[PDB]
Amino acid sequence: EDPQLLVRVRGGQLRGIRLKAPGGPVSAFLGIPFAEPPVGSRRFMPPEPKRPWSGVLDATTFQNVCYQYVDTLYPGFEGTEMWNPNRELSEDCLYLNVWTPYPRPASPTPVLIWIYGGGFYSGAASLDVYDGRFLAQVEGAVLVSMNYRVGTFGFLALPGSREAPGNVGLLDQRLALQWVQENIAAFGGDPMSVTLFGESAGAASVGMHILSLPSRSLFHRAVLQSGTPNGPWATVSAGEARRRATLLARLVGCNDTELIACLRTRPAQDLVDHEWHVLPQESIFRFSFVPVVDGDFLSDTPEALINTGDFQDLQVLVGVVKDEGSYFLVYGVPGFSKDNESLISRAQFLAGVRIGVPQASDLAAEAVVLHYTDWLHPEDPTHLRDAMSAVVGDHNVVCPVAQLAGRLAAQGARVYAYIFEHRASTLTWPLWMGVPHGYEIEFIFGLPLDPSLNYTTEERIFAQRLMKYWTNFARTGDPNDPRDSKSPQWPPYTTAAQQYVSLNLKPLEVRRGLRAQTCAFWNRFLPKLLSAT
Amino acid sequence: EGREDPQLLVRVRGGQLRGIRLKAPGGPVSAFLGIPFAEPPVGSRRFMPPEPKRPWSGVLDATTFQNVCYQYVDTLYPGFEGTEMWNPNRELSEDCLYLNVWTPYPRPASPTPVLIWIYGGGFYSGAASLDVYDGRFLAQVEGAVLVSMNYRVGTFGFLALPGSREAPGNVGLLDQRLALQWVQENIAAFGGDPMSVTLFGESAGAASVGMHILSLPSRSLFHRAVLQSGTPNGPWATVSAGEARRRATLLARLVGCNDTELIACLRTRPAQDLVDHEWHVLPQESIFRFSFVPVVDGDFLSDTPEALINTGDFQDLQVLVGVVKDEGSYFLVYGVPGFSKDNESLISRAQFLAGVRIGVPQASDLAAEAVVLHYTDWLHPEDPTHLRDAMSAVVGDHNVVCPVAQLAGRLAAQGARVYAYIFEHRASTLTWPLWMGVPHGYEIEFIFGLPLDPSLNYTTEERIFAQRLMKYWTNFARTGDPNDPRDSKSPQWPPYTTAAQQYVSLNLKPLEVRRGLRAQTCAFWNRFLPKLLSA
């Protein structure tokens, strides 16, 4: 019975497990319950604190993955399977994971809290790419990650009702953050230095914690990788949420109370089976059950809240990968596949656009096409393919990120921005997809430090750089290495200079303007257009 | 005759002419100036189609430029050479339908390709007698036969009550066509070849050339065409029948005047009173808009130029078209607040938003918004230097560069052989400020070879440059190809095509080939803006 692996938290005692990281051991406490299982009459409801337990809770293994749709586009393909659940599905899934240095930090160590992505309909804290042992061993970080409910279980809402108020998946995250405040000191973590980071919908979640008052006392700094609370996919209105719920109810054979009671009797997979059938249009990068503007968790739209908020007290790191959109094309756009070069025609490009920008009027869709067409080579299939990706990536991630960065900087926040440009040597998706959505994560978490993974030595050096930026940001709100003159420095993003850095194998290079012209089109012009036409 | 220079006596259909022997740098040329080609369109003939000049008796003296057509005189910067060079240099008169001929001296042996110049001036001004249009250099150095004609401008040339008998519209264009007919009948008397006639013109002259291309009756009067910084399509070169009617009747009201009675009253007004009110009938505060221009009458112009270029067959057409580096700059000082020739015209973002409304006068709020969004530099949305240059670009792109791109594009896609250029050399003698770059109209003096005149103070490179340009233009006139057959060592000027979109830079350096005539931005003006109009 190793005393390092024994911890007492408010709920009782836990036993962790000593894990091996390439350069030493780490203590891991996996599958720790932070809420009462949200099952039965608790489905769709806010989470409740876990009841205390007797004896020593076994925390040596990952708990179940929250019930969710499982990707079947390319069965058995590593590129898709790496995001698929790697433990049993169950509605009983509200557990978190802690990694710390072995032995446990002598002084209170900055805490990093990871919130996974997966479009709010999927994901799990137990995936290999979220392995916290590297950051724990190399950087001496305390790293936390929670499961939170996704899809219907996490975001189905009949706004105003008592039994499906919406946003309970975000309340799961918040409960887990509360748990960190109350318990993390027992592991050596410093509750007074907590940094949230997350990718895609996890980044959007981080963004919503920034914009929700009760969350603000649970962390001090934030990192948003390739996702934002503002933008086209991360939220829905009360009315559109209500619409999607009652439609799903109808689809599975079901006054709010009675509607929800009948939904509560449905086996989990019955709900998932119809999840994708409630979207208003044929689309990509669009998800049926996501956070809802309830006037509660989110008092107004994220757009409104970032425009009017005071962010003086906030430090943020935000960024995008080089090819945000490519991934999503093979999930809905005719002409695209991981198996060929997806060279498309002009007609297929105009088709792709109505799908990639599903809420666009005819005129707006024409605007997009004409903006993104290269008029020197209007019909070149290679350009058209790359343009289709750019449209999807720009509309859904890059421009929403440029918008957020700008509002935050303009309203007092300390902001750092990046674009991640290195394509992993181990990547299984075709070359034409470039650096796809989500493929910076394995580098931030430091997976290349594991020799059995076959990353190149330059990549291993790269990963170490990124872990430094992230953990330095966690420690100080500034990703710059304090023990390093010469670099050059990573400057804050401001509305004046608009500086950000490229992250890749070469040293930091400072650039200005994050797709400035193109994001002016999306952020300034298109709104004016659609609100008229 | 008896003791006159026997080489200067010529007979044309209307009678005998005596020309004058002029000195050009490299030798003498023959000039026949102020030849009448129409009955004076005065009195009851105001607003009417021209009638062919009736024969005269004796020897008409043709040694001096004739009257300039009655027009507005520019007074923005009185005494300033930059404006005065474009002002009338002979007496104003409604009796102004005369043309000019320069030829080698002695006149050519075999029949020589003919160049016909059509001056610009917004359809409200201009004259064939200006210094920058001096035909002596092309005649002497290239052996060209050069013809230029006066044509009515302003109300006199373009006031229209469409459908009426007394003011049918486009009479200024019919003056041009009458002069083309005169060339067909008479130019062989000077050694000119009526079967090789190339039209060239700049600004409204260029738009005029484009309208002769689109007008069937003019099509048997010429064989090749050059359009410099102007097009028959675009926002300023034509008005609708309704808009012309509206402007004519408003102008009538302003001067105290059933179409017949209205026009009859207009014919009693002194020329100057019409000129004094012509700017007052424009629909909005604007620049690069002119009150009385060609009208889509369904006669001379069977449909809008846009419709005609979109659907015409242009197999038989050889055309040279181009633009200067800074088409819009000149126009800014004539009405965009913040702009002047006498300072750097650094402007604010607010002055930019206002300038856009004036420079794109027909835009709705949303459309103006699109323009401001597109042209703003979003790394430096507030920089006064960038904003100044963007304002100029907005005006140049909207009025010239994108209409020319559209024209070259449709003509090529539909059979025509098209050559395209951008002219980038700023004259060492320019009197406009540096901020204006290479302004609208300032290639003309190079095409006509003025830098060959030692007394004008051009540099030796400019002289050599002028000679190259004169070669391109005359080669194109001779063969429909600007390239020199002998000289293959010199870089070649490829045709412009929809597939490759190639065009050349004209400057002190050897031809450089480029692709895409503001392709992205012109996609905005030519493909998107019109649709933002169906909404």
Quick one: which H or E segment has residue A472? helix A457-476
For chain A, give the residues followed by a break (C–N over 2.5 Å): 254
Distances in whole angstroms, Cα of residue A489 to Cα of each of A412, A478, A479, A510, B389? 21, 10, 9, 9, 34
Residues in Cβ contact with A103 at an 8 Å cutoff, skipping those fewer than 6 apart: A4, A27
Chain A, 406 to 435: residues with Cβ < 8 Å from chain B are: none
Of A111, A96, A101, A102, residue with least CA distance to A185: A111
Which residue does chain B place closest to A523, by CA atoms? Answer: B373
B166 inside 8 A of chain A by CB: no
Chain B, 454 to 493: residues with Cβ < 8 Å from chain A are: none
Terminal Cα distance for chain A, rounded: 70
- Whether residue B300 contacts residue B228, with contact meaning beta carbons closer than 8 Å, is answered with no
- Whether residue A190 contacts residue A162, with contact meaning beta carbons closer than 8 Å, is answered with no
- Whether residue A168 contacts residue A155, with contact meaning beta carbons closer than 8 Å, is answered with yes
**Contact assignment for A520 to B379 by CB distance below 8 Å:** no
Q: Which residues of B63-92 are buried (b: 16+ CB within 10 A; e: fewer)?
A: bebbbbbbbbebeebeeeebbeebbbebeb
Which residue does chain B place closest to A376, by CA atoms? Answer: B516
A496 inside 8 A of chain B by CB: no
Query: Distance (Å, rounded) from C-alpha A380 to C-alpha A377?
Result: 6
Tokens found for residue B381: 């949305």
Place of tokens 């000191």: A185
Residues in Cβ contact with A362 at an 8 Å cutoff, skipping those fewer than 6 apart: none
Query: Distance (Å, rounded) from C-alpha A439 to C-alpha B58?
Result: 93
- Whether residue A116 contacts residue A125, with contact meaning beta carbons closer than 8 Å, is answered with yes
Resolution (A): 2.4
Query: Distance (Å, rounded) from C-alpha B37 to C-alpha B177?
Result: 11
Of B105, B472, B445, B484, residue with least CA distance to B320: B472
Looking at the complex, report in whole angstroms how far the Cα of residue A379 sits from the nearest Cα belonging to chain B: 10
**Contact assignment for B369 to A528 by CB distance below 8 Å:** yes
Quick one: which H or E segment has residue B454? none
Q: Amino acid identity, residue A386?
A: D
- Chain A residues in contact with B515 by the CB 8 A cut-off are 376
Residues in Cβ contact with B296 at an 8 Å cutoff, skipping those fewer than 6 apart: B238, B239, B240, B241, B303, B304, B305
Reply yes or no: is the peptide bond before residue A214 cis, omega within 30 of 0. Answer: no
Query: Distance (Å, rounded) from C-alpha A360 to C-alpha A530?
Result: 7
Q: How many CB pairs under 8 A join A and B?
A: 43
Which residue does chain B place closest to A512, by CA atoms? Answer: B379
CA quadruple A460, A463, A464, A465: dihedral sign: positive
**Contact assignment for A376 to B501 by CB distance below 8 Å:** yes
- Whether residue A180 contacts residue A111, with contact meaning beta carbons closer than 8 Å, is answered with yes
Q: What is the DSSP string of A157-216?
A: B-TT-SS-BS-HHHHHHHHHHHHHHHHGGGGTEEEEEEEEEEETHHHHHHHHHHT-GGGT
**Contact assignment for B373 to A524 by CB distance below 8 Å:** yes
Cα–Cα–Cα angle for B368, B371, B377, nearest 5°?
135
Q: Residue A432: how many CB atoms within 10 A of its CB?
A: 18
The upper half-sphere exposure of residue A147, i.e. CA atoms within 13 Å in the direction of its Cβ, equals 34
Which residue does chain B place closest to A373, by CA atoms? Answer: B520
- Chain A residues in contact with B523 by the CB 8 A cut-off are 370, 373, 375
Tokens found for residue A36: 């009462």
φ/ψ region of A342 (left if φ > 0, alpha if ψ in -120 to 50, else beta) reads left
Interface test with B, best of A374, A375, A515 (most B CBs within 10 A): A375
Of B315, B81, B54, B290, residue with least CA distance to B172: B290
A72 inside 8 A of chain B by CB: no
Question: In terms of DSSP bridges, do strands A17-21 and A499-503 run parallel, antiparallel, or are they unpaired?
Answer: unpaired
Cα–Cα–Cα angle for A377, A380, A382, nearest 5°?
120
Terminal Cα distance for chain B, rounded: 71
Question: Alpha helix locations (H) across B346-456?
Answer: 349-359, 365-375, 384-396, 402-413, 444-447
Distances in whole angstroms, Cα of residue B413 to Cα of each of B316, B332, B410, B421? 13, 34, 5, 18
Tokens found for residue A384: 């058209």
Strand stretches in B171-277, DSSP E: 192-202, 224-228
Distances in whole angstroms, Cα of residue B165 to Cα of each of A123, B52, B159, B261, B295? 80, 18, 13, 12, 15
Q: Amino acid identity, residue A522?
A: W
Looking at the complex, report in whole angstroms how far the Cα of residue B373 sits from the nearest Cα belonging to chain A: 7
Q: Please give the positions of A annotated as active site.
A: 200, 324, 437
Q: Residue A239: how many CB atoms within 10 A of its CB?
A: 11
Residue A530's Cβ-count burial label (10 Å; 0-12, 13-18, 19+) is: middle
**Contact assignment for B378 to A520 by CB distance below 8 Å:** yes
Question: In terms of DSSP bridges, do strands A24-33 and A95-101 run parallel, antiparallel, or are they unpaired?
Answer: antiparallel
B75 inside 8 A of chain A by CB: no
Tokens found for residue A188: 């050596």
- Whether residue B17 contacts residue B62, with contact meaning beta carbons closer than 8 Å, is answered with yes
Distances in whole angstroms, Cα of residue B479 to Cα of each of B118, B318, B320, B443, B469? 20, 9, 12, 22, 15
- Whether residue B29 contacts residue B104, with contact meaning beta carbons closer than 8 Å, is answered with yes
Residue B456's Cβ-count burial label (10 Å; 0-12, 13-18, 19+) is: middle
Q: What is the DSSP string of A304-363?
A: HHHHH---TT-EEEEEEETBTTHHHHTTT-TT--SSS-----HHHHHHHHHHHSTT--HH
Crossing angle of helices B365-375 and B384-396, in 10° steps, is 120
B533 inside 8 A of chain A by CB: no
**Contact assignment for B379 to A516 by CB distance below 8 Å:** yes
A532 inside 8 A of chain B by CB: yes
CA A251 distance to own-chain centroid? 29
- Chain B residues in contact with A370 by the CB 8 A cut-off are 523-524, 527-528
Radius of gyration of the CA atoms of chain B, in A: 23
Which method was used? X-ray
B127 inside 8 A of chain A by CB: no
Crossing angle of helices B171-186 and B204-213, in 10° steps, is 70
Long-range CB contacts for residues A50-55, cutoff 8 Å, separation at least 24: A50/A11, A50/A94, A51/A11, A52/A10, A52/A11, A52/A12, A53/A11, A53/A12, A54/A12, A55/A12, A55/A13
Question: In terms of DSSP bridges, do strands A414-420 and A109-115 run parallel, antiparallel, or are they unpaired?
Answer: unpaired
**Contact assignment for B523 to A367 by CB distance below 8 Å:** no
Q: What is the DSSP string of A227-265?
A: --SSSSSS-EEHHHHHHHHHHHHHHTT--HHHHHHHHHT
Place of tokens 């484009």: B210
CA A8 distance to own-chain centroid? 31
Domain total of chain B: 1
Q: What is the DSSP string of B473-492?
A: HHHHHHHS--S-SS--SSPP
**Contact assignment for A363 to B535 by CB distance below 8 Å:** yes
- Chain B residues in contact with A513 by the CB 8 A cut-off are 378-379
A370 inside 8 A of chain B by CB: yes
Reply yes or no: is the peptide bond before residue B106 cis, omega within 30 of 0. Answer: yes
- Whether residue A165 contacts residue A133, with contact meaning beta carbons closer than 8 Å, is answered with no
Which residue does chain B place closest to A497, by CA atoms? Answer: B379
Residues in Cβ contact with A336 at an 8 Å cutoff, skipping those fewer than 6 apart: A329, A330, A342, A344, A352, A385, A388
A338: domain range?
1-533
- Whether residue B150 contacts residue B231, with contact meaning beta carbons closer than 8 Å, is answered with no
Of B492, B511, B520, B514, residue with least CA distance to B501: B514
Tokens found for residue B15: 């009678």
Residue B479's Cβ-count burial label (10 Å; 0-12, 13-18, 19+) is: middle
- Whether residue A146 contacts residue A117, with contact meaning beta carbons closer than 8 Å, is answered with no
- Chain B residues in contact with A522 by the CB 8 A cut-off are none
Q: Please give the positions of B annotated as active site.
A: 203, 327, 440
Phi, psi of A436 (to 5 degrees): -80, 160
**Contact assignment for A513 to B376 by CB distance below 8 Å:** no
**Contact assignment for A524 to B379 by CB distance below 8 Å:** no
Query: Distance (Å, rounded) from C-alpha B330 to C-alpha B437?
Result: 9
Tokens found for residue B28: 């003498």
Looking at the complex, report in whole angstroms how far the Cα of residue B442 sits from the nearest Cα belonging to chain A: 29
Of B476, B440, B424, B47, residue with least CA distance to B206: B440
Of B180, B260, B256, residue with least CA distance to B225: B180
**Contact assignment for A525 to B370 by CB distance below 8 Å:** yes
- Chain B residues in contact with A529 by the CB 8 A cut-off are 366
Quick one: which H or E segment has residue B323? strand B318-324
SS3 B8: helix
Of B252, B239, B238, B89, residue with least CA distance to B155: B252
SS3 A20: strand
Query: Distance (Å, rounded) from C-alpha A498 to C-alpha A403?
Result: 11
- Chain B residues in contact with A517 by the CB 8 A cut-off are 378
- Whether residue B371 contacts residue B363, with contact meaning beta carbons closer than 8 Å, is answered with yes
**Contact assignment for A517 to B370 by CB distance below 8 Å:** no
The CATH number of the domain holding residue B460 is 3.40.50.1820
Cα–Cα–Cα angle for A44, A49, A52, nearest 5°?
135
CA quadruple B222, B108, B60, B123: dihedral sign: positive
Interface test with A, best of B371, B378, B521 (most A CBs within 10 A): B378
Q: Residue A325: how many CB atoms within 10 A of its CB?
A: 27
Query: Distance (Å, rounded) from C-alpha A423 to C-alpha A436?
Result: 8
Which residue does chain A place closest to B368, by CA atoms? Answer: A525
Q: Which residues of A181-216 are buried (b: 16+ CB within 10 A; e: fewer)?
A: bebbbebbbbbebbbbbbbbbbbbbbbbbbbbeebe
Place of tokens 């756009």: A333
The upper half-sphere exposure of residue B122, i.e. CA atoms within 13 Å in the direction of its Cβ, equals 21
- Whether residue B333 contacts residue B339, with contact meaning beta carbons closer than 8 Å, is answered with yes
SS3 B82: helix
- CA trace torsion A7, A10, A11, A16 (10° rounding): -20
**Contact assignment for B519 to A376 by CB distance below 8 Å:** yes
- Whether residue A220 contacts residue A184, with contact meaning beta carbons closer than 8 Å, is answered with no
Phi, psi of A283 (to 5 degrees): -160, 165
**Contact assignment for A533 to B531 by CB distance below 8 Å:** no
CA B263 distance to own-chain centroid? 28
Query: Distance (Å, rounded) from C-alpha A210 to C-alpha A404?
Result: 12
